[PDB]
């Protein structure tokens, strides 16, 4: 990709890679990548998190844990390291621990695995909040897809890889085809 303008003047280019730095990821320094138009991944060192955007909610506020404060996230994940990782991610999405609706998660004591749920439905008291959380996603994942249908339900689900709730989606066939993008990490740094 180099051509000549003048007899000596020449068009030249250079391509940079941040992968040697994105590989040294950690909870405070997450590497963010997009797989499907429905699967996203955050690698924070030893803790990997699958993020999904669907219309399928498995949690209810009448049965599951409501997270009003970051500390409540300790009830959602097997380790507190992951708890603060998800705290910083929630901040990065634009969630307001003081004003926005509380998110839902599954008590870590249960058998089904970790699952944090955001109601991003385009309807009723979930509409406004919803858009924000999608904007955050658009900032944190280049090329984010908006599968949420107007007037219908939509949810963002976070599952820590390793728990039963990750199913087989955290396998090697997935994370090996999820190129890290440093622009996402820069947006995470700025928004948190």
């Amino acid at each position: 990709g180099t051509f000549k303008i003048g007899l000596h003047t020449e068009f030249q280019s250079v391509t940079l890679t941040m992968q040697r730095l994105l590989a040294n990821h950690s909870n405070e320094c997450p590497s963010l990548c997009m797989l499907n138009n429905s699967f996203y991944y955050m690698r924070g060192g030893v803790n990997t998190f699958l993020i999904r955007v669907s219309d399928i909610s498995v949690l209810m506020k009448e049965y599951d844990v409501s997270i009003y404060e970051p500390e409540d996230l300790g009830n959602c994940l097997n380790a507190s390291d992951s708890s603060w990782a998800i705290h910083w991610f929630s901040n990065a999405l634009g969630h307001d621990w003081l004003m926005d609706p509380p998110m839902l998660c599954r008590n870590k004591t249960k058998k089904e695995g970790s699952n944090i749920q955001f109601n991003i439905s385009k309807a009723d008291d979930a509409r406004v909040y919803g858009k924000k959380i999608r904007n955050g996603m658009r900032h944190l994942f280049r090329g984010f897809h908006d599968p949420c249908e107007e007037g219908k339900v939509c949810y963002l689900t976070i599952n820590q890889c390793g728990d039963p709730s990750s199913f087989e989606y955290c396998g090697v066939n997935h994370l090996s085809k999820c190129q890290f993008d440093h622009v996402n990490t820069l947006h995470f740094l700025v928004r948190s």
Partner: antibody, heavy 120, light 109 residues
Framework: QVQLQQSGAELVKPGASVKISCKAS????????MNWVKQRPGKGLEWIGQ????????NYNGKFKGKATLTADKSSSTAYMQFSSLTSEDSAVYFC?????????????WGQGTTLTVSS | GDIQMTQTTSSLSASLGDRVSISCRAS??????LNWYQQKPDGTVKLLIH???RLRSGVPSRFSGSGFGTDYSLTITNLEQEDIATYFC?????????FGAGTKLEIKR
């Protein structure tokens, strides 16, 4: 589509053991708690225990601890309840029931029941 | 330490099209974690209402649940023939899970 098919009626003599079965269909057997319930005329419904076929953890009711033993087989998607030292007090109808995804402690799908009679 | 469920009425007579109420009382506050089951005369069992008043899919609208604390109630308006059955309540707060004794509905004449 979700179905729980229990084994047939049993007639045993005192002091005997017996294993009743419950075959599940239509869902991930390892993702739902399988509970057992005992019914007798005029004695309502008694909760015996529950097993999680995923890891195999069992939670028993203190009253039935020692009388009942719960096992599971994921390949056959079949839960089993074994009774030991049966007495006439153990004659009843036994249901297997399923909790919903997660652990909501409500039984959304029931088997047809298995009649156990203990008599000399 | 167990939690006792009390369905004071064991039998209840009513004519088709009536409003029926079945009470359920808990020995401890169970925080709306009450569920209602229907048992037909053939032994069939089905969940109808969970968390006090949340209807399950397929349950006709004439069924409804109410209460909070220790006292709860299942209400059946416009009693249909197929509703003639026995109804049990169940607390889902703490193990061991416990059921009521049941309330059988019978037709009046």
């Amino acid at each position: 589509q979700v179905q729980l098919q229990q084994s047939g009626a049993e007639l045993v003599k005192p002091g005997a053991s017996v294993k009743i079965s419950c075959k599940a269909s239509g869902y991930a057997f390892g993702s739902h708690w399988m509970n057992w319930v005992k019914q007798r005329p005029g004695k309502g419904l008694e909760w015996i225990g529950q097993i999680y076929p995923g890891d195999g953890d069992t939670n028993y009711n203190g009253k039935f601890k020692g009388k009942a033993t719960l096992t599971a087989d994921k390949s056959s998607s079949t839960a089993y309840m074994q009774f030991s030292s049966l007495t006439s007090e153990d004659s009843a109808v036994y249901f297997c029931a399923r909790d919903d995804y997660g652990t909501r402690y409500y039984f959304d799908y029931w088997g047809q029941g298995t009649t156990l009679t203990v008599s000399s | 330490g167990d939690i006792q469920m009390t369905q004071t009425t064991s039998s209840l007579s009513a004519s088709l099209g009536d409003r029926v109420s079945i009470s359920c009382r808990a020995s401890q506050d169970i925080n709306n974690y009450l569920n209602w089951y229907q048992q037909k005369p053939d032994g069939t069992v089905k969940l109808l209402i969970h968390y006090t008043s949340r209807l399950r899919s397929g349950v006709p609208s004439r069924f409804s649940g109410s209460g909070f604390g220790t006292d709860y109630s299942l209400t059946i308006t416009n009693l249909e023939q197929e509703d003639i059955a026995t109804y049990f309540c169940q607390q889902g707060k703490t193990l061991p899970l416990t059921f009521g004794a049941g309330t059988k509905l019978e037709i009046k004449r």
